[PDB]
């Protein structure tokens, strides 16, 4: 019919039209956006001759300014703002503002000055600056495309990217005030009003966004399972803050994205992964769709209404034009590089020249032009301003978007260094070593023998894309550094690859290893970590000052009460507001006395509420002094509102009742801080682990890694230093923030937990022992259960001494034997320095630290052990005098477990998991763990799959004859934990801490009583 949506067939065609320029001109360096332009111009001149086509074409190309803006902007800003790696523009912010701040405006008034100069249109300087504000937005898109492709390119891309994106926004601030300002003059304007404006467009703004970015996240933080509702809710976050802060509030909408775009990337972990993975490539289709459209229309509009209007001079403008923009971005650049050189990471002069040629303009400036273009209509303004944008736009997508690639050339910036160029040749080697493996494989089955292998091995090749003397003993020393700087990239690596390690704690432990390895003699020094762990003061200051205000024990009624009354305020504020606004609202009559009803329940509300405070609390209600706040707000109403039955009565009151909740606000303006040093421990327990763990990998490389026993030994000395720094530093951290630390710690076990749960259920489902619909209803709930964790409190309570008793590894759910324990473990309280035993001193009992950090000291062997920690396990089972001696780097705290009392749990509690196995393998899965490790150091397993290995091992009873026999079908490992051990054949004897070798078929053992033999086996998954 006549009314149909002539519009589908316009979006439709242009889609069609984007997918057959992207896909021919995809390998051609030109832009397939220019293309696009030509198309647009070649269906511009035949719907001008064609009066059907024009129909098709005339109700999207005349389409109204506001329309445009607030479908496609939000969309481009939005998706602009959305694909930053937001960590890296944070760490560069002050270095991406100056420039796109500061170089916007003095680059768009340089612009405004040339187009007044220059050109015979004799404009104005409104109409120059909405000239220049939309000449000087940027879309490097084309750029940081091939920055991300390359090396030390990976930390300019942001930077670039994040100018183009605060540099679009202001230029659409600047273009708006200057549009409204030449095609909708206001009569005048005061100082005050200019400086509301500006707070309304630049301060205003930002707020807005933030707020309803936050709101957002909550509520995405609490969908569980409703992917939908998620991808919903964050398209009606978008269009509905531009939306509302454009036309109901007028702040700057486009501001408002940016943020939001900005705080929803940052918060990303509050997104489901599988929606987070769909909202990017989302938006990009979204984006790509309006730069489509807009090209299109560009192209029409130009070859309709532009291209009748231009002399041969301008032509002549247009390339003196482009020439005096790339020079004032040249100027202002150059001109700020004294500045930014001081600041984040500072430009290099390749980079100046990257940064200088690569900002290309985009649909953001033919936007602008366009709706220019409409608002003038008749007037040659327009035509001009799209004739120029697009020629604009036009030769930067020709010139600079096709030379940036040569231009990287000449830099040197292009090229892959060596250590990537051997990565990918040796990537490339595995890879066709596996496919020859693979092919003779396949050339044995009976069912494939006759496969034309000519063909299938040509289809199946990968190629390769980028094709004792003083100095021979400082080349060992840098050889040894080197290699061992290698081995911590790839044991970081692996660690982030296994989910032990945060991406940004990984990041920063690569970049302090390779920028170790730039410098001459440098290793990792833990002093260049410290800047993970060390907490900005000002969060705990206010942390302190905060918990003061409501600390509350002169006083210190169900809680309910206080949240009711605190409800029934905030739902006052209604009313208060409506009379304050009503009062100029009349200046409605009836509303004068609606008001009043509302005002008595409310104040009766509040009588009522602080009489059942007052009886409850006796004569204490009145020493505190929020509740002296709360009477003086009932002793002015009381007299208010009487007197009432005006500018008095309206004014007090809108400030006084609000006020009383700023109690309630105080506890979460807590947690705020809470979350912020949550966040800066998680880290920093991330990467002084994750350095530890990358330590303890080197240290067993190295050890047979390096030849040399001197270069050996400096090199383990620095890293035992390093370590030790490290275990100190962090064990620190808990005692000055308990509750933050067990939350970080607690979040980190369960997501451990998960994870190996996850892991379990794919191995059933690869197995076939469960369904794949099954596999997936499990892994929904382990998914839900994960995100919960980001909703955990940021500070839990740190459990009291009664609870860690009750968590040991050896005492867990043995309620009888909890009890025993409990009631014989005395509590002792030492002080700074202190010495809490000694080498030599006789196996007395064991320590556990409930408060505190230790040192070890003994027999060149230093350690530091915290809370958690139990010291003389060994000890006690083998009634050796101890080996250590343990020294108060702080005031500790530790339950003691006399000696005896341990012996008489030991003989009473013997059921089959008797106390005695408990303790015996906790002690034999921490004296296995090295030598597994020991056994496997060039193989593929870390320290944390040798402990999850051993853990599915059992001590055995040698009790049954005293001799053992290896089935080795069903002993992946077998260890020797204490005593000697003969070998049936050959009797030869081993000693008690080693490894059983797989020559070894039987043993036998001696069974004197004061070292008895015990063995830890591991079995086969395929048990018997």
């Given at each position: 019919h006549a009314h149909a949506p002539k519009v589908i067939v316009f979006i439709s065609g242009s889609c069609l039209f984007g997918a057959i320029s992207r896909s021919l001109f995809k390998?051609?360096?030109?832009?397939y956006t220019v293309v696009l332009l030509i198309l647009g111009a070649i269906l511009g001149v035949v719907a001008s001759n064609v009066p059907l086509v024009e129909e098709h074409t005339r109700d999207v190309a005349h389409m109204d300014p506001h329309v445009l803006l607030q479908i496609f902007l939000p969309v481009l800003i939005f998706e602009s703002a959305f694909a930053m790696d937001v960590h890296t523009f944070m760490r560069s912010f002050s270095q991406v503002c100056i420039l796109a701040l500061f170089g916007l405006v003095v680059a768009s008034v340089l612009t405004a000055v040339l187009a007044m100069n220059l050109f015979?249109?004799?404009?104005?300087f409104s109409e120059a600056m909405m000239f220049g504000a939309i000449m000087s937005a940027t879309d490097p898109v084309a750029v940081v495309a091939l920055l991300k492709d390359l090396g030390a390119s990976k930390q300019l891309g942001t930077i670039i990217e994040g100018e183009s994106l605060l540099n679009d926004g202001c230029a659409i601030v600047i273009f708006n005030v200057f549009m409204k300002m030449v095609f909708?003059?206001?009569?005048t304007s005061t100082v005050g009003q200019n400086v509301l404006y500006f707070l309304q467009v630049a301060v205003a703004g930002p707020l807005w966004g933030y707020a309803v970015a936050k709101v957002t996240v909550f509520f995405l933080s609490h969908i569980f399972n409703d992917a939908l509702v998620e991808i919903t809710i964050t398209l009606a976050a978008t269009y509905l803050t531009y939306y509302i802060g454009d036309i109901?509030?007028?702040?700057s909408g486009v501001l408002a994205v940016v943020v939001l775009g900005l705080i929803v990337n940052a918060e990303?972990?509050?997104?489901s992964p599988e929606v987070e993975v769909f909202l990017h490539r989302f938006w990009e289709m979204l984006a790509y769709l309006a730069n489509t459209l807009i090209f299109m229309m560009v192209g029409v509009v130009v070859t309709q209404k532009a291209l009748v209007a231009v002399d041969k001079m301008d032509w002549f403008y247009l390339i003196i034009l482009y020439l005096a923009i790339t020079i004032i971005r040249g100027m202002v650049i150059s001109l700020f590089s004294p500045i930014l050189?001081?600041?984040?990471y500072g430009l290099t002069w390749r980079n100046a020249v990257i940064m200088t040629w690569g900002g290309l303009r985009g649909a953001v400036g033919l936007a602008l032009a366009l709706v220019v273009e409409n608002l003038a209509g008749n007037d040659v303004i327009g035509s001009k301003f799209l004739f120029h944008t697009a020629g604009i736009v036009v030769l930067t997508l020709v010139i600079n978007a096709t030379t940036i690639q040569t231009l990287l050339r000449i830099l040197g910036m292009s090229d892959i260094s060596i250590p990537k160029r051997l990565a990918m040749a040796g990537a490339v080697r595995r890879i066709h070593e596996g496919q020859n493996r693979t092919l003779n494989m396949l050339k044995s089955d009976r069912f494939l023998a006759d496969a034309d292998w000519d063909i299938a091995t040509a289809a199946c090749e990968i190629s390769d894309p980028y094709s004792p003397s003083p100095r021979e003993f400082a080349d060992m020393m840098e050889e040894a550094r080197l290699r061992m700087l290698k081995a911590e990239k790839i044991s970081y690596w692996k660690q982030f690859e296994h989910g032990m390690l945060a991406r940004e704690a990984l990041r920063l432990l690569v970049q302090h290893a390779e920028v170790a390895a730039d410098?001459?003699?440098?290793?990792?020094?833990v002093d260049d970590l410290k800047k993970s762990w060390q907490i900005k003061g000002i969060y705990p200051w206010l942390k302190r000052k905060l918990e003061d205000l409501i600390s509350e024990k002169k006083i210190a009624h169900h809680m309910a009460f206080e949240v009711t009354i605190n409800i029934a305020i905030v739902l006052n504020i209604v009313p208060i507001i409506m009379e304050f606004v009503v009062q100029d609202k009349m200046?409605?009559?009836?509303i004068e006395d609606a008001l009043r009803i509302s005002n008595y329940v409310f104040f009766v509300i509040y009588a009522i509420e602080a009489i059942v405070k007052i009886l409850g609390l006796?004569?204490?209600?009145?020493?505190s002094h929020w509740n002296k706040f709360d009477a003086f707000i009932l002793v002015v109403a009381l007299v208010d509102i009487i007197i009432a039955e005006v500018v008095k009565l309206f004014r007090l009151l809108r400030g006084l009742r609000?006020?009383?909740l700023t109690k309630a606000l105080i506890p979460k303006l807590i947690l705020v801080v809470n979350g912020k040093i949550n966040n800066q421990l998680s880290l920093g327990y991330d990467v002084g682990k994750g350095y530890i763990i990358g330590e303890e990998e080197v240290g067993k490389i190295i050890?047979?890694?390096?030849?040399?026993k001197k270069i050996l030994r400096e090199l383990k000395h620095i890293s035992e230093t390093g370590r030790l720094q490290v275990v100190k530093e962090l064990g620190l951290l808990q005692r000055e923030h308990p509750g933050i630390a067990v939350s970080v710690k607690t979040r980190q076990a369960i997501r451990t937990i998960l994870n190996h749960s996850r892991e379990t259920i794919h191995e059933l489902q690869g197995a076939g022992l469960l369904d794949e619909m099954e596999a997936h209803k499990l892994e929904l709930t382990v998914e839900i259960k994960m995100k919960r964790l980001m909703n955990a409190p940021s500070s839990i309570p740190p459990p009291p001494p009664e609870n860690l008793l009750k968590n040991v590894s050896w005492l867990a759910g043995d309620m009888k034997l909890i009890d025993f324990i409990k009631a014989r473990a005395s509590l002792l309280h030492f002080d700074y320095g202190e010495v809490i035993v000694r080498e030599?001193?006789?196996?007395d009992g064991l320590f556990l630290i409930v408060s505190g950090l230790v040192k070890l000291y003994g027999k060149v062997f230093e350690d530091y052990l915290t809370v958690g920690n139990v010291i003389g396990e060994m000890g006690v089972l083998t009634?050796?005098?101890?080996n250590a001696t343990v020294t108060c780097e702080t005031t500790v705290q530790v339950y003691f477990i006399t000696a005896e009392d341990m012996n008489i749990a030991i003989d009473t509690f013997?059921?089959?998991?008797?106390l005695e196995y408990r303790l015996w393998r906790v002690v034999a899965i921490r004296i296995a763990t090295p030598l597994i490790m020991e056994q496997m150091?060039?193989?593929?397993?870390?320290q944390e799959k040798v402990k999850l290995h051993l853990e599915r091992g059992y001590l055995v009873?040698?009790?049954?004859?005293?001799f053992q026999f290896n089935i080795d079908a069903t002993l992946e490992d077998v260890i020797l934990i204490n005593g000697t051990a003969y070998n049936?054949?050959?009797?030869e004897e081993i000693r008690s801490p080693c490894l059983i070798s797989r020559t070894v078929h039987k043993l036998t053992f001696q069974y004197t009583a004061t070292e008895e033999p015990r063995l830890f086996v591991v079995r086969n998954a395929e048990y018997n």
């Open positions: 390998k051609l360096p030109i832009p015979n249109y004799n404009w104005n909708f003059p206001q009569l109901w509030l007028e702040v990303k972990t509050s997104i050189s001081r600041i984040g410098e001459k003699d440098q290793f990792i020094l200046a409605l009559q009836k006796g004569r204490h209600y009145i020493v609000m006020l009383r050890d047979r890694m390096v030849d040399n030599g001193d006789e196996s009634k050796k005098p101890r013997t059921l089959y998991p008797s150091a060039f193989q593929g397993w870390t009873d040698l009790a049954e004859s005293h049936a054949h050959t009797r």
